[PDB]
């Protein structure tokens, strides 16, 4: 059943750019401030959780999900659209790769498929574009450490250190002066805690802060070692109790 022009994707701005992109970046500009940093020996990503009702449980809402534990993810954008995107991203990553190569998907191929999901919403008429801004942080054996930023416009670019949110304009200057390429993962974690704190200083504890890093392969996180060749999960989510341990030493 098709009704007239309902697929119309005519909306355009007088400047030539898509108006749906500017309205998507505007909503993310007011949203909660996330960030991420790609260091030499590791990659760190951090974001602030949502308070809303004081009786809400922080364990229910998770702003960092897991696709396959070679790659981390964080989003400052649409909350609901992230759950739908991850569900579709996995099915595309499983069908186009895991149902063929049966391994962990590479970072370069996975980001290209996520960019298509945001495009299909813009390509297919009647469906609003995804207003999510995704930071895809992963470590492979070819490109090494890779930190990619997928904008709601549907394009992705690599970043050494970047931040998205309300303080994204101020944090962009902070990451240039405070962080350098010579700083390692341990140096980037302390910067991630200071940069994220400067956004909302109301509560700096680990209850409202979700911190996750991609380190070396941990054999305990996989649950089984029968093969010394198989590498363990590179993605490890830090407990909020462990976050407060680094805050006291910071």
């Amino acid at each position: 059943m098709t009704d007239r022009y309902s697929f119309s994707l005519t909306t355009f701005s007088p400047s030539g750019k898509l108006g749906q992109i500017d309205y998507a970046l505007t909503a993310v500009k007011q949203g909660v401030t996330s960030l991420g940093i790609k260091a030499t020996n590791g990659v760190v990503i951090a974001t602030e959780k949502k308070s809303s009702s004081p009786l809400a449980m922080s364990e229910t809402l998770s702003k960092v999900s897991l696709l396959t534990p070679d790659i981390g993810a964080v989003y400052s954008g649409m909350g609901p659209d992230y759950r739908v995107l991850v569900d579709k991203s996995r099915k595309v990553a499983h069908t186009s790769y895991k149902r063929i190569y049966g391994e962990y998907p590479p970072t370069k191929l996975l980001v290209s498929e996520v960019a298509k999901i945001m495009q299909e919403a813009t390509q297919s008429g009647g469906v609003r574009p995804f207003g999510v801004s995704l930071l895809i942080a992963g470590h492979d054996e070819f490109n090494g450490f890779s930190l990619y930023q997928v904008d709601p416009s549907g394009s992705y670019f690599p970043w050494k250190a970047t931040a998205i949110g309300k303080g994204s304009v101020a944090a962009k200057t902070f990451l240039e002066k405070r962080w350098n390429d010579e700083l390692e993962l341990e140096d980037a974690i302390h910067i991630a805690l200071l940069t994220l704190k400067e956004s909302v200083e109301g509560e700096f504890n680990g209850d409202t802060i979700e911190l996750a890093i991609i380190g070396d392969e941990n054999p305990d996180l996989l649950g089984y070692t029968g093969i010394p060749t198989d590498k363990g999960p590179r993605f490890r989510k830090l407990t909020s109790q462990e976050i407060n341990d680094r805050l006291e030493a910071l």
């Binding site: 059943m1 909503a27 449980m57 364990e59 609901p80």
Partner: protein, 241 residues
């Protein structure tokens, strides 16, 4: 203008239609109170009393989706039954593909995405109701997930709806700060139901009879709803204190 009627983004970058989904939630003006106990989950919703030409027993805001699973909806009633059948269909099909009891956290994810698909479609309109799912999980115990009509879901210690929700949320917020626990003492589920009625009357400032309210009960491996005699029996022990 036309920017309010379009499904795509507005000039402010914020959808007005998502905000208009909450306009219909206040039509019934029902204040629901559900808390997470130790071994049990107590759910209490206001039952509007019509004239003598209607049956108050048939009127209910709480429906049984599956075993141990229950849902209270605050919003349009005709839009609630359409959403109730969607949750019941996904509950039985989940067991055929897996074979274990469907948890509440996952049931809040399925109904949120399906309600979110309506937001993306240019024909199907989003559900203007509020989806609050309650059950007793095996591993996680009692859990309450309130699904927003736009596809957002988060857990609450004590959920509240209606225009008076500010009275219920605040009165139950200070009660949880003194005990410093989200659960409630007296593990027996009989007195836990009575603890929620007293906190609801003191917050609303009006004592309701058995015909002015309905009380859902979620226990281990069982789900039921208290009848008129069981609800009246609860007010007897509360009256003596």
């Amino acid at each position: 203008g036309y920017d309010r009627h379009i499904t795509i983004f507005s000039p402010e970058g914020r959808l007005y239609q998502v905000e208009y989904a909450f306009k219909a939630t206040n039509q019934t003006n029902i204040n629901s109170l559900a808390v997470r106990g130790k071994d049990c989950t107590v759910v209490i919703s206001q039952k509007k009393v019509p004239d003598k030409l209607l049956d108050p027993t048939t009127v209910s805001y709480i429906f049984c989706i599956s075993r141990t699973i229950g849902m209270v909806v605050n919003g349009p009633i005709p839009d609630a039954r359409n959403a109730a059948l969607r949750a019941k269909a996904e509950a039985a099909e989940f067991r055929y593909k897996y074979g274990y009891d469907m948890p509440c956290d996952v049931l809040a994810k399925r109904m949120a995405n399906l309600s979110q698909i309506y937001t993306q479609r240019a024909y199907m309109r989003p559900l203007g109701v509020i989806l609050t799912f309650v059950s007793v999980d095996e591993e996680l115990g009692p859990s309450i997930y309130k699904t927003d009509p736009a596809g957002y879901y988060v857990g609450y210690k004590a959920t509240a709806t209606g225009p008076k929700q500010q009275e219920i949320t605040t009165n139950l917020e200070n009660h949880f700060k003194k005990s410093k626990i989200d659960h409630i003492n007296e593990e027996s589920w009989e007195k836990v139901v009575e603890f929620a009625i007293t906190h609801m009357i003191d917050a609303l400032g009006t004592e309701f009879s058995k015909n002015d309210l309905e009380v859902g009960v979620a226990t281990k491996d069982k789900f039921f709803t208290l009848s008129a005699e069981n609800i009246e029996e609860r007010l007897v022990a509360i009256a003596e204190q």
